[PDB]
Symmetry: C5
Subunit: 319 residues, 5 copies
Amino acid sequence: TFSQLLLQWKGSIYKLLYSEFLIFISLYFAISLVYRLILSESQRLMFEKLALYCNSYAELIPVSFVLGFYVSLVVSRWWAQYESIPWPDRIMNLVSCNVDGEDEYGRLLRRTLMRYSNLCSVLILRSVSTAVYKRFPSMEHVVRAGLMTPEEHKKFESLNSPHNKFWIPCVWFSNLAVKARNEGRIRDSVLLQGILNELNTLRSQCGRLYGYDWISIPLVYTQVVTVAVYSFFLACLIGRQFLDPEKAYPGHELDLFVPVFTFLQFFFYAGWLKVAEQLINPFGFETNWLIDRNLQVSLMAVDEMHQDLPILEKDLYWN
Amino acid sequence: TFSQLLLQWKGSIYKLLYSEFLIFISLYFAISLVYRLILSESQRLMFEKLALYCNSYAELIPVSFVLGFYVSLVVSRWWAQYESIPWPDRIMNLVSCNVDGEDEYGRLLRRTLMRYSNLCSVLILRSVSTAVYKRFPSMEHVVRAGLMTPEEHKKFESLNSPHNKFWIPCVWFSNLAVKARNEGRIRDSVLLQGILNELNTLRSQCGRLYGYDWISIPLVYTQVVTVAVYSFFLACLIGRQFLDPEKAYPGHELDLFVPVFTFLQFFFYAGWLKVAEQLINPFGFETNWLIDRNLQVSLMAVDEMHQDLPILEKDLYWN
Amino acid sequence: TFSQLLLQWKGSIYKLLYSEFLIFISLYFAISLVYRLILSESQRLMFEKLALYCNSYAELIPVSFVLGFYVSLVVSRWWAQYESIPWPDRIMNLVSCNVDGEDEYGRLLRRTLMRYSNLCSVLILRSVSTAVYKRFPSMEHVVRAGLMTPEEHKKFESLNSPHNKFWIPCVWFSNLAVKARNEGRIRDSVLLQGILNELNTLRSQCGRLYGYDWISIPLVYTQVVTVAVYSFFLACLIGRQFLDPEKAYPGHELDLFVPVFTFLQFFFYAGWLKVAEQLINPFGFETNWLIDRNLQVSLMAVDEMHQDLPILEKDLYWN
Amino acid sequence: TFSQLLLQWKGSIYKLLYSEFLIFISLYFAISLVYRLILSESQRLMFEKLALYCNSYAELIPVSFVLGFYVSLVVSRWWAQYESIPWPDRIMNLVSCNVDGEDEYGRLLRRTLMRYSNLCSVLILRSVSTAVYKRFPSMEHVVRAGLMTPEEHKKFESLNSPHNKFWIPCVWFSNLAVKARNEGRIRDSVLLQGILNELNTLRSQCGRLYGYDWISIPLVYTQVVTVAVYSFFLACLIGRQFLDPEKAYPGHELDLFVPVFTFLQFFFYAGWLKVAEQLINPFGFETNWLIDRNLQVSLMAVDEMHQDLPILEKDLYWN
Amino acid sequence: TFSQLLLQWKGSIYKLLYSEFLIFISLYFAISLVYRLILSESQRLMFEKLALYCNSYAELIPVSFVLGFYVSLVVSRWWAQYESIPWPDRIMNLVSCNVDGEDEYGRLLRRTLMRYSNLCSVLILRSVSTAVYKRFPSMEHVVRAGLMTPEEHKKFESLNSPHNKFWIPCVWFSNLAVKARNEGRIRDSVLLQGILNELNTLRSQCGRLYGYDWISIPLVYTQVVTVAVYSFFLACLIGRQFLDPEKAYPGHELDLFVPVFTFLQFFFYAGWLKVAEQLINPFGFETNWLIDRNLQVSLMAVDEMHQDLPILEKDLYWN
């Protein structure tokens, strides 16, 4: 199963390492052809004493430390951001059953509550993602996709605040469910409070995405691991050359014109640096798909599925 | 205890590494017999300078880094997927006691609720597993096993959605428990809300299996660790040869016809790569057993065990 | 404090490594005496070229990787199993106060509830432990210790299920607390539901021990780390010999008749493999003590301590 | 994306390593010029035998261990402190809806509750941060920013306690919400208890910041990793010198006047020590911004947004 | 900031490593003076062949593995024990408001409840700490500090149990709050159950300290890492000697009379073993301070702060 995953291209390592590899191939053979064709005899001698100096400081081992601890923090943080995505499904199961009414008003009342829950999720995704920000560059594009009505857009800007306004529909939700309770649509206080708790569960997950994006991996700690990988390949552009074996240096007794086991270390060390680079901004998760799923499912379960059940009949294991 | 676990075959390392080992044995002795029998005297000399080149780039240590951090992420993620399995037992203890009625209707009413809870678990297991998907290739096979009645199958397809419909029975559950409350079968709002919370507990565990399967370990990070293991064994097909000791190379002063301590490194490095490969798709967990347990226990505890208790008598420690 | 913990014997490393060490001492000096006394002069020469071959493949470093990542997964999983032990103390504090009645019936009613909670814990401990399984080999031994009355034993076998029946008393609990509520012993629905939630808290902890035991560390991943430790000591039975220093091999210029710094590596590498071996089955935790504590405390707090409090008098800090 | 993050200055590694680098450059070339210009011929010989001694104890590898495990504990603890920040948004959604009243009193009553919640967060941030402590050096500065009224300041000092008084407004909150319930402003006990639970959720997050600051990474464990980095660079001020290549030492056959691959190890090892140093006091998080956001949003959502909703009209997906 | 933390003494590494260092200095120069002054010429020769044998088995790298994984488990477990400390503040906010009454009885009733909560925390701290056990050697010392009245001391010993009796006041709490509810002091069942849940939250944190102390890091795993550190310094007492450079051994061409870079490895390896040793018994946390804080704050907030609030006046941001 791992033996066949090398041959895939889309989303693989070769599409991602296609540009940095051809730079490394170009800077390798250019230095080699200067040594092989251009430089004079004593100038070949000055290069060989420099390549032996560069070949010692390419210790493979302390580069493998800093890539291991860095990437393991990136992937761990990447898993926490997916667990912090607001799924509307817990509010959806309570709005669909405890907000009573099957007339025009109570149907409109349920559809407004689930449209506030998704709006409290879109307005944080368009600040932490670049794909959702390209889908909704302004607030008018949110109105065009029907997440926000033209009456809610005007109220959204009279509320004047210099901060991120993702918390606006999560206060509109709880004020509408109390207004729904005081008209008889929600029966009890216990059922009202159960709806208000799953709001604050989703309020807190939108408050984690608001925190993981703004507080990233430290920029100084990114820059350490990129120097040490580029420093390793810096010495390998000089140290891993094939010299002339006539001068009997230790470890250069065969010319091969191409370092096979050095270019495989490029797809190891630089490829394990591109792991952390692809995951440090994981929103450029199909989040345009994610919004289309959550909006379509939520409005479905509270409008087409409110108190209309299949017929209760006996199953196959009846006694 | 660890001393005797080497000799087991079923589920061991030797059943899993039987094919990749005989390829490695075949590619080893074939290269050796070309050096020993076919190649001429100067052609033996060109091989020996290539084997000394290959023997240096087989550094054992930076391969052991990338297998350690990779497999430790695989096993950690493997443990989270087992903790995310929906057990019906928490809903089962509340449906069996608070959904009152011992006539034909209330018995049918309890058995429908626990059959929706298992159906909200099967429809996510047949998307994350290949064994359950072979057990239920279509939705008609779910009806044949009695998880879904022929009235619920027709309602399940009138609900039109281009997404995974595992959320359908978790909305049918909460709408039936509210209908059960408004006929007098559930007594209070506090007992109704307690049933609706354990639904959303199981709704969230089905929503983790929906996430761990679709969002896997990154494909680029799989492909790094498989190059570096196969690159290590690539140099060992050339570097670990037994040369002629007459030419006095350092570390080749004895012919043995079989590298014992290299083939043990195959069962170390390739065997510690097969650990992550067996765990990255752990559903191909006896999940056909798991569904048969959860369905049989849930229907048992709400139908044979509703309010029929053993006789209250004094225990052994009575004063 | 660490300086004195070497000298302890009970539960130490020397009681655990007493058998594997004397095998390693025996296989060492036997190979040495063949080289020193039995083999001829050319046969001494063939051994010395084999010991130089074995001494290179005993790289200490890539063995220390696979023991570090393996044992750190074992100890982490070992800590999760202790946090998953059902303590009855949360149910005990609610049964002792909200299940009213001080006559013969309500006293019997409280003692039955806490005896179901411990029985829902014993029946999972006798499947995950070998010590509790030796304490209770059958179900009749559970009746002899008074956990199960002879009326509950007959009901326990009329309930026919091919699976583990630890879930039986956790359904008996919730059906008895509803019967207690409908006789006036529990006052309200809010107090009933609070008792039924701490049942499902303990139901879920018994459902983790049901999962950590059946789903272990993978058998292929155990077998990797035991080959690599035994392969390391395999080369050290040949490579770490003291040769004749007259032939001037590099690193053999002194005979000592006993490798002190190799036998210390046995108590390092094999001793750090016995860490994971002692922890991978941690039930062979004083779980016979644990059951005796939980049963005695639970029946105490609901029978001797129900609504009988010390006298309310003023403390030392009164104003 | 990682290729361009090297060139940034603000918040990068070069602003942080500007002072320690020029000390290291100064102590390098000063020792070199003493060897090159000042010392006599035999005194050059005594230095060269000292530089060969220093060059062996600069093992790069066991320094990379202790920096990896240390920094990974620092960054993990740094992520826990951001998850422990009290956001007022969960209390804000319940105070804005369940504390009824639109007259002068109930508007004043809501604004007092959210001003106690922020005050229970500021008084712990001015003990764990130095930026908030510079913003509020005394308690009078808290009154000047309007967090505390001049009547609450006098009560705050009559309460005499030798400890940190951050727990004072979290007891004032719960006593005011009970007084609000007993005047009819909060309707039920279920809605009162829901407000009192989100207080204790925020009480516990303020109790984590009270614990992460006082209980830090151990001072002995900080001092280990700083010796080992400074010891590594101590040997490199002697060992990494360019000697005279006329005396044919192994690894000194070329003069370069500047160690390029040693100064890159300064920006690797010392730069990966400055990662943990910047994160071990992460409050010197824009916490002056954080207080200005939370105070302005909380008073907004309970005063301008209490029960004043946009007009319920049909969305774009109406049928 | 890290540059100045070397110079501190109190709580540093030098106070902790003052005894083990002077032993290591004494055993070093004693062996050196035997080689330099006492032993004869051939006896100097037998030492030099032993020091070359000892210098190879002091591989720095596989000692750094076992200290890294061990200490990272110690510090992780050390952080969990601080998060498991029972703070009384969540019970304190509910007892201070929902236990009504301002006369002599209800004031006495509140002060008894918070004195049971601290007593359920002290009786577990005097079993897991040695400082609290020295503060309270018996149960009579608990009465002298006013935690337990002389009426509660007599009831505490009539309850006969061979186990740790820390669970006694956590059952007295819940029985007193039910007695307070049935006299009209607590209003509703919802407010009673909210007090009984924060008891079981604190009951579970006292049940973690009861578990982290009794179930420690395994004794076999402590003893591994202490052999391997002491074995490393064992070879360094022989291998790191300065020999006579007249005999031209590789790596001994300069006498220095003091190994500077070996004694720095003592403050690295032994100092990183003292990290885990100081943290494995972290109670010998200012827990005498902790009890004095929690008792004084809890009795304060329920007696001086019950329903006596500051005057509601308008803040600075009024409109």
